C-alpha cells in the first residue's frame, strides 16, 4: 500500500524515495506516462527515465540522459523516435533532431515538407553553405508542399461549393436522397465522399459530429421517435437554406470546413510567401485567389449557417424560430491577412 | 492621350493608367506612368496591367516596395526585393521585420562580412520584441553563446531546452550558473503573480 504509506511516511526522504518508485510504477500500471515519467526520478535510475519518456513524449530530456550516460545508441533512440514522430505527425522534432544529431540535413528539409516552414528549411539547407541547394532540397521540396496544398485547397473550395447546394452534389462522388429520416452521413474525415442515409453512418462512430452544435439528438417532446434531430423535412422544394437542411450535419461540415480553412491559413500564407520568395509569384496569386474565393463564398453564408440545440421537436418550420442560440456554438470563420503583392 | 486626359478629367485613374501604358510599345516603360502611380498610389492596377511584360512589372516591384517600405509594411518590401534583388535593402526590410532567418540565411550566402552584425541587429531586436526563444536561437547559433542562450532560454520560461544546450558545451555547470537560479527566479516571479 502507498496511500499508507503517503501520510505518515510523507516526509522521509529516503523512504519517499522508494514510495515514489511504487507510486510510479502503479500510475504506468494506471496505463498513464507523463506523471509515472515525473515520477519514475526521485531515486536517480534514469534507464527507466528513458523507458517512460518513450511513452511520453518527453524527447528531448530522454535524448539528454541518454547522451550523459549512453552515447552510444543515441543515434538510434533519435531514429527510434523519428519512427513514432511520422507516426505521431510531428514532423518539425523530427527533422531538429535529425538536421542537429543526425547527419544529413536533406530528410531534415523533407520533413519540414510535412510541416510547411519553408524559412527553417531554406536556414538549415543554406546552413551547408551552397545557395544550389535551395534548388536541391527546398525548391523541389516547396514545389511539392506548393502540389500538396493547392490539391488540398482545392478539396476545400469543393466542399465549400458542394455544401453551398441543397444536394451538396459538387464534387464526384457526394450525394444523399430526399426524405430521409435520419444519418449523419459524415464517413468521410472532410466529407469528401458521402453515401445515402440508409447506408451512410449506420456505425456507432460519428467524427466530428458533435464538436459542432450544442444540442443531441435526446428529443424532450419525443418526437422522430428520438431519432436525430432535425431530420423532418428533406425536401428539395425548401427554397432557402440554414437549419433547414440536416441541421447538424451542415454544420459539422462547415465546422470542418472553417477549422481546415483556420490551421491551413497560416501554413497557407507560409507556402504562398515562400512561392513568392521563388519568382513563382504566379502560383502565389493562384493560391491566394483560390484562397480569397472560398473565404469570400463563406463570408455571406454563415448568416444562414444555423442549428438549434435543444428546441427542434418534429420543427414543421424550415430555419425555426429566427435565431434562438448565437452564432458561436455554430461554426463561424475568421479574417484573411492577405499580402499585397500576388494582386 | 485624348483618352488619358479624359479618363483624368473625370478622376478615373485607373482608366488613365491603362491607356497611358499602351502609347508606347517600346520594351522600357515610361516614366510618366510611374510618376502617376506615385502620385495616386494605384501600383495594383500596375501588376494586374502588367503581369505580360516582366521587366516592366519588376519596375512596378520596385516603387512598389518602395511605397509599402515608406508607408507601412515591410515584409511586402523584402519580399519585392526578392526580384530586384537590392541587397542592402532586402536586409533591411527583413530586419525590421523580425524576420532573422530569411535575411540571416541571405546574409551568409551574399555578405560573409556583415554576419554577425545583422545577428546583433537581430538579438537586440528580440530583446526588445522580448522573443527570447529565436533570441536564444541566434545567441547559440550565431553569436555561439552557450551562457547567454541559456540565460533567453530562462528568460522564455525554458528549461529543458535550455539543459540541452548545457549539456551541448559539456558545461554542467551552467545549471548552478544560469539554470538554478533562472528556476529560482521563476519561482520567485510566479508567487509575486
Not at chain 1, 501554413?267 to 496569386?285: I, K, S, T
Not at chain 2, 473625370?10 to 520594351?27: F, M
Not at chain 2, 519580399?79 to 532567418?101: D, F, I, N, T
Not at chain 2, 536561437?137 to 525554458?158: F, G, H, M, P, S
Amino acid at each position: 500500500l502507498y496511500k499508507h504509506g503517503l501520510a505518515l511516511y510523507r516526509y522521509d526522504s529516503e523512504k519517499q524515495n522508494v514510495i515514489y518508485n511504487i507510486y510510479a510504477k502503479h500510475l504506468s500500471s494506471n496505463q498513464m506516462y507523463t506523471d509515472a515519467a515525473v515520477a519514475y526520478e526521485m531515486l536517480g535510475k534514469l534507464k527507466e527515465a528513458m523507458g517512460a519518456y518513450q511513452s511520453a513524449k518527453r524527447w528531448r530530456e530522454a535524448m539528454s540522459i541518454a547522451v550523459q550516460k549512453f552515447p552510444e545508441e543515441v543515434e538510434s533512440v533519435a531514429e527510434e523516435l523519428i519512427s513514432s514522430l511520422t507516426f505521431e505527425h510531428r514532423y518539425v522534432d523530427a527533422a531538429d533532431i535529425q538536421l542537429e544529431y543526425l547527419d544529413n540535413v536533406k530528410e531534415a528539409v523533407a520533413l519540414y515538407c510535412k510541416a510547411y516552414r519553408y524559412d527553417i528549411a531554406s536556414l538549415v539547407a543554406i546552413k551547408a553553405k551552397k545557395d544550389e541547394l535551395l534548388e536541391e532540397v527546398v525548391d523541389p521540396g516547396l514545389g511539392e508542399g506548393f502540389g500538396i496544398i493547392a490539391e488540398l485547397l482545392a478539396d476545400c473550395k469543393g466542399q465549400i461549393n458542394s455544401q453551398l447546394r441543397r444536394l451538396r452534389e459538387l464534387r464526384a462522388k457526394k450525394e444523399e436522397n430526399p426524405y430521409a429520416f435520419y444519418g449523419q452521413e459524415t464517413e468521410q474525415a472532410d466529407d469528401v465522399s458521402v453515401a445515402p442515409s440508409e447506408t451512410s453512418t449506420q456505425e456507432s462512430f460519428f467524427t466530428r459530429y458533435t464538436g459542432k452544435t450544442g444540442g443531441t439528438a435526446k428529443t424532450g417532446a419525443s418526437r422522430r421517435t428520438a431519432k436525430n434531430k432535425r431530420r423532418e423535412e428533406r425536401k428539395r422544394a425548401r427554397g432557402k437554406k440554414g437549419t433547414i437542411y440536416e441541421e447538424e450535419y451542415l454544420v459539422q461540415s462547415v465546422g470542418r470546413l472553417i477549422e481546415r480553412l483556420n490551421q491551413t491559413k497560416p501554413d497557407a500564407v507560409r507556402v504562398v510567401e515562400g512561392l513568392c520568395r521563388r519568382n513563382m509569384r504566379e502560383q502565389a496569386h493562384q493560391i491566394q485567389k483560390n484562397f480569397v474565393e472560398v473565404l469570400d463564398l463563406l463570408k455571406a453564408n454563415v448568416k444562414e449557417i444555423y442549428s438549434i440545440s435543444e428546441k427542434d421537436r418534429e420543427r414543421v418550420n424550415e430555419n425555426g424560430e429566427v435565431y434562438y442560440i448565437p452564432e458561436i456554438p455554430v461554426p463561424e470563420i475568421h479574417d484573411f491577412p492577405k499580402s499585397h503583392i500576388v494582386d | 492621350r485624348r483618352k488619358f486626359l479624359i479618363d483624368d478629367y473625370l478622376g478615373n485613374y485607373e482608366k488613365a493608367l491603362e491607356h497611358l501604358s499602351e502609347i508606347d510599345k517600346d520594351g522600357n516603360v515610361s516614366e510618366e506612368v510611374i510618376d502617376y502611380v506615385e502620385s495616386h498610389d494605384l501600383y495594383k492596377h500596375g501588376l494586374a496591367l502588367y503581369r505580360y511584360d516582366s521587366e516592366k512589372q519588376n519596375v512596378i516591384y520596385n516603387i512598389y516596395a518602395k511605397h509599402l517600405s515608406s508607408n507601412q509594411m515591410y515584409t511586402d518590401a523584402a519580399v519585392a526585393y526578392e526580384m530586384l534583388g537590392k541587397l542592402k535593402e532586402a536586409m533591411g526590410a527583413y530586419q525590421s521585420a523580425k524576420r532573422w532567418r530569411e535575411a540571416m540565411s541571405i546574409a551568409v550566402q551574399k555578405f560573409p562580412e556583415e554576419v554577425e552584425s545583422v545577428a546583433e541587429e537581430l538579438i537586440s531586436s528580440l530583446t526588445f520584441e522580448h522573443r527570447y526563444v529565436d533570441a536564444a536561437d541566434i545567441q547559440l547559433e550565431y553569436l555561439d553563446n552557450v551562457k547567454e542562450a541559456v540565460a533567453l532560454y530562462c528568460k522564455a520560461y525554458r528549461y529543458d531546452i535550455a539543459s540541452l544546450v548545457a549539456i551541448k558545451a559539456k558545461k554542467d555547470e551552467l545549471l548552478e550558473e544560469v539554470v538554478d537560479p533562472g528556476l529560482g527566479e521563476g519561482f520567485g516571479i510566479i508567487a509575486e503573480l
